[PDB]
């Protein structure tokens, strides 16, 4: 079956195959795709005699629902072949079944597993878990990532807003931790750069295949009304993919149009949302995501409990064409993670690239090596920061609905080692003449016309004419008018004075 392969050393894989017994929930396309990424990577290691000659790199996989069925697979990994896990003061000499864990995607599951694995220092590499607290190596000593942190996603969003001068925005967050702290982070960044946040609202976490009550529907109306009335035409959404299906329908029902929607990585490249044809009419859809890396031949490969999925194949076959037509983005995170473990083990065993001296491996010995790997994989160098991140590039994708070529066109790239957004390209807007859509609290004042703030938001001001005999020294102040020297006078709103009798 797909979920096990024997070998001399086992990796442990944790993947979310069902969304909402964990089997009873609706299946996810992306989860099975990522699982296939891991399986393909390990097959390639077993083909490549240059990496691990004569050593069978095996894998064992378990489905972990979004935030459920945790704990159980960790016990299954740490317990020995007699299915018993001994309690000990010092585990230096202990030998688990798996030597590394390719950890979950969701941050809460990642922490739930890390608080357990830190006890044994079993190395854990997590794709796509962007929560910032995972940089705290005092708290999570055994954890590494093959994706940049949430810091860099927020920085990419902010620099995108700066490039097009969208200093007046709206933020929507899901009523859960992922939305809450990401909104907090975006606010923290925004206040520092001169952008203003019109308001922030919390979405209800509605299940997509579930009925909606009166109060929830009225909440959705109450949010979209604020969207419709406000002058801020840029909306940033922080939510899991699942919750948005209900929200956008309501937006469609309200005849709303003409906003720029900025998507976080949790839904920026979701096929299930993309396939809704009518989103075309709400405006421009942009999203921040991990870079695209074409795997050499991944598609041709893609063609004691919870180790099974019945619905995955038939469900994925409905998406197969768009999946192949789309790029490979997080698949590369999983692939490079397996390759990182492979290189760490390869150097730890000291294999000479002709034969390997097979040995009992204690996980902490491999954990102390996984930090020192530095190698090219598909022309990208992967190596880990001291805080645990691989500095892969981010890219900004516009959603395009021509089913013939590509659903997610890259219009920009972002470099986290330099912390800069670059290579911004020809975005195609919803506007009447393709002119850049605009949002600002209030329009820039006339010359000789001082500002007066209207509220808390620095961006918002009235323009007031300087009375005669005073002038606005634009170069030295903005909120008051200098008095002309006694030999000179001024024509009301003007930057300068004139000699007069």
């Amino acid at each position: 079956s797909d979920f096990y392969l024997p070998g001399d050393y086992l990796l442990g894989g944790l993947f979310s195959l069902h969304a909402n017994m964990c089997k009873e929930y609706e299946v996810k396309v992306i989860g099975y795709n990522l699982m296939q990424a891991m399986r393909f990577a390990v097959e390639e290691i077993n083909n490549d005699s240059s990496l691990l000659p004569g050593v069978l790199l095996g894998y064992e996989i378990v489905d972990v629902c979004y935030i459920s069925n945790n704990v159980q697979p960790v016990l299954y990994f740490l317990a020995h072949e007699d299915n018993l896990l001994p309690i000990q003061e010092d585990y230096s000499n202990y030998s688990s079944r798996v030597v590394a864990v390719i950890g979950p995607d969701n941050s809460e599951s990642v922490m739930t597993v890390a608080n357990f694995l830190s006890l044994f220092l079993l190395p854990q590499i997590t794709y796509s878990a962007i929560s910032d607290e995972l940089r705290d190596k005092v708290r999570f000593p055994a954890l590494l990532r093959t994706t940049p942190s949430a810091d860099h996603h927020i920085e990419a969003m902010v620099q995108l807003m700066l490039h097009f001068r969208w200093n007046w925005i709206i933020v929507l967050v899901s009523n859960d931790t992922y939305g809450r702290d990401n909104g907090q982070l975006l606010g923290e960044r925004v206040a520092r750069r001169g952008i203003c946040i019109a308001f922030q609202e919390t979405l209800p976490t509605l299940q997509p295949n579930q009925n909606m009550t009166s109060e929830e529907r009225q909440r959705l109306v109450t949010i979209v009304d604020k969207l419709q009335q406000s002058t801020a035409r840029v909306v940033v959404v922080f939510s899991p993919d699942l919750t948005l299906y209900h929200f956008f329908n309501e937006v469609l029902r309200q005849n709303f149009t003409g906003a720029v929607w900025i998507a976080s990585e949790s839904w920026a490249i979701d096929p299930v949302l993309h396939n809704l044809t009518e989103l075309r009419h709400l405006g421009t859809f942009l999203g921040i995501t991990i870079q695209s890396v074409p795997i050499p031949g991944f598609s041709e490969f893609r063609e004691t409990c919870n180790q099974e999925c019945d619905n995955c194949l038939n469900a994925t076959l409905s998406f197969n064409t768009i999946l192949r037509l789309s790029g490979e983005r997080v698949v590369y995170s999983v692939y490079s993670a397996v390759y990182a473990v492979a290189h760490a083990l390869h150097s730890l065993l000291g294999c000479d690239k002709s034969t390997c001296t097979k040995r009992v491996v204690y996980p902490w010995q491999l954990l102390e090596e996984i930090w020192k790997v530095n190698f090219t994989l598909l022309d990208h160098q992967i190596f880990f920061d001291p805080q645990g991140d691989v500095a892969l590039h981010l890219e900004i994708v516009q959603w395009q609905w021509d089913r013939s070529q590509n659903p997610f066109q890259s219009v920009a790239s972002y470099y986290p080692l330099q912390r800069q957004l670059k290579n911004i390209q020809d975005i195609s807007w919803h506007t009447i003449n393709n002119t850049i859509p605009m949002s600002m609290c209030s329009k820039r004042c006339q010359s000789g016309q001082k500002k007066k703030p209207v509220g808390i938001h620095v961006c918002c001001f009235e323009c007031i004419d300087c009375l005669p005999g005073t002038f606005l020294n634009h170069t030295e102040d903005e909120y008051e008018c200098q008095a002309c020297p006694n030999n000179e006078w001024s024509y009301q709103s003007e930057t300068s004075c004139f000699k007069r009798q």
Partner: protein
């Protein structure tokens, strides 16, 4: 001393316990290179009292016949050491097979034989999260003093966590009720930088919207001047407080942080606002000892109300004396607990006890578990049906519908695992040179006020409000963190109110004129 050995007892059923009985110094906190154990090298004063309270409750339950007639209840205590790794090792030990050194891996654990009946929970809320997600998978009931976060309420992730103290949500329900009563509709909300303040801000920012209160601005505030930025941003928070023209500030933070803010407010004079900050701030001496603090204006807060068990201090002294007596010694639960003397701890703390509340809680916690067992064995006055050994997940069936008694106070767990409890409303009165906490109300699910006993600085009620809809001839502007209030501008003469739902004025033509607040352009 015998103290480290006194924390254990045998019985027909056994209770586990996680207490802050020790700690390790900073050098140990370095990123671990090898899975060695943690040297928790020093004693802790508060954990000793918590453990002694648990011992006292169990001793009374064993001596009396009001619970568990004819069988003996034992306990094993462990230190959390404030360290997740130590906490997790101790937690793992509880689930090990009976009298055995290992834990078995299975698909589901409604078939299994752990070694303890229930766990008296850890002190800190983050350890409560860490340990609850683990325990509840085994469906072992875990009863926690302290640990007030709302996160642990939800039953889907924490199906077995219970606690004997009220949560943050009910406290903020009381706070929002106080705001509602006095029509303090337009407020600022602040909170500390930790998960405590984070969830304070979040809970208030949800409840206020649900109850029609518009937050002028949010704010996460620093613990202390630990870095060069934190000397500054506090002043921007205060600038926003002044710019929003708010009169009432909610502030969900510990005292040290509020003390910092207070001192900054004093430096620049500010103005006499109203502060509705939490009990952690209302209680702390270092705040009211600020000599200039009367300038702060007005201080209100809700303080938890609870019973007394006066025997406790004498019990602590008694068993410390026994710990010292070698005749008792002649008759591992905490290393290094035995090296600190009796006097400066006992006479030092017992004369100075919020830490009193946690005694009663830690007492009540045991009485819950015992009562649940008393119910699960269906005990008569004379006998208990212990013909079969009960398993932890069976108690969890009963614990939700029980009621249990503690020192003439009576309690029950609600459907989400809290216990319902009540508060005093206490205001600082400082017309006396010494500031005095003074009762002016009560909260038992709805706010009762003794209006006469409140001395506002001007002897008149403060207010901060916002217009929630503008009049006909007025232009709106939205304000608030959630765009909740409006501020209204009278449209000036020579221009007119375009239509009764607009956000804009409109000029009148050259040949015609319009009165102020007019809707039309006229001859």
């Amino acid at each position: 001393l015998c103290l480290s050995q006194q924390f254990k007892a045998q019985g027909d059923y056994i209770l586990g316990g996680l207490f802050p009985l020790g700690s390790t110094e900073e050098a140990t906190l370095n990123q671990r290179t090898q899975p060695n154990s943690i040297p928790c090298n020093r004693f802790s004063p508060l954990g000793l009292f918590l453990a002694m309270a648990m011992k006292m409750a169990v001793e009374e339950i064993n001596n009396g016949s009001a619970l568990l007639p004819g069988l003996r209840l034992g306990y094993d205590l462990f230190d959390t050491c404030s360290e997740p790794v130590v906490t997790m090792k101790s937690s793992l030990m509880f689930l090990a097979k009976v009298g055995s050194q290992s834990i078995a891996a299975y698909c589901n654990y409604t078939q299994y034989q752990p070694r303890v009946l229930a766990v008296i929970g850890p002190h800190s809320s983050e350890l409560a999260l860490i340990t609850g997600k683990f325990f509840s998978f085994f469906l072992m009931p875990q009863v926690s003093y302290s640990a007030s976060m709302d996160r642990l309420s939800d039953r889907e992730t924490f199906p077995s966590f219970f606690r004997t103290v009220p949560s943050d949500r009910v406290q903020l329900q009381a706070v929002v009720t106080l705001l509602q009563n006095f029509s303090w509709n337009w407020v600022a909300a602040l909170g500390s930088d930790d998960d405590y303040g984070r969830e304070g801000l979040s809970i208030f920012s949800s409840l206020a919207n649900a109850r029609g209160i518009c937050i002028a601005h949010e704010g996460l505030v620093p613990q202390h001047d630990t870095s060069g930025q934190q000397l500054g941003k506090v002043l921007d928070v205060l600038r926003q407080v002044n710019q929003s023209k708010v009169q009432v500030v909610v502030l969900f933070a510990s005292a040290r942080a509020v003390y910092s803010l207070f001192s900054y407010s004093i430096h620049h004079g500010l103005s006499p606002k109203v502060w509705v900050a939490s009990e952690s701030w209302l209680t702390s001496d270092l705040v009211m000892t600020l000599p200039n603090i009367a300038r702060v204006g007005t201080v209100l807060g809700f303080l938890q109300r609870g019973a007394l068990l006066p025997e406790f201090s004498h019990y602590v002294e008694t068993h410390l004396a026994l710990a010292a007596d070698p005749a008792f010694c002649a008759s591992q639960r905490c290393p290094r607990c035995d090296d600190i003397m009796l006097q400066n701890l006992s006479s030092g703390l017992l004369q100075n006890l919020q830490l009193h509340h946690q005694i009663f809680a830690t007492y009540a916690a045991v009485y819950s578990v015992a009562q649940a067992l008393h119910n699960t064995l269906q005990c008569n006055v004379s006998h208990c049906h212990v013909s079969e050994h009960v398993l932890p997940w069976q108690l969890l069936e009963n614990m939700y519908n029980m009621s249990f008694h503690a020192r003439d106070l009576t309690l029950q767990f609600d459907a989400e695992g809290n216990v319902d409890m009540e508060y005093d409303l206490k205001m600082w009165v400082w017309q006396s040179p010494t500031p005095v906490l003074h009762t002016v109300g009560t909260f038992n699910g709805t706010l009762q006020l003794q209006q006469s006993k409140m001395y506002w600085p001007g002897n008149q009620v403060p207010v901060s409000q916002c217009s929630r809809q503008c009049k006909d001839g007025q232009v709106r502007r939205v304000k608030g963190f959630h765009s909740c209030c409006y501020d209204c501008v009278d449209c000036k003469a020579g221009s007119y109110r375009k239509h009764p739902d607009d956000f804009t004025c409109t000029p009148c033509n050259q040949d015609q004129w319009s009165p102020e607040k007019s809707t039309a352009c006229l001859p």
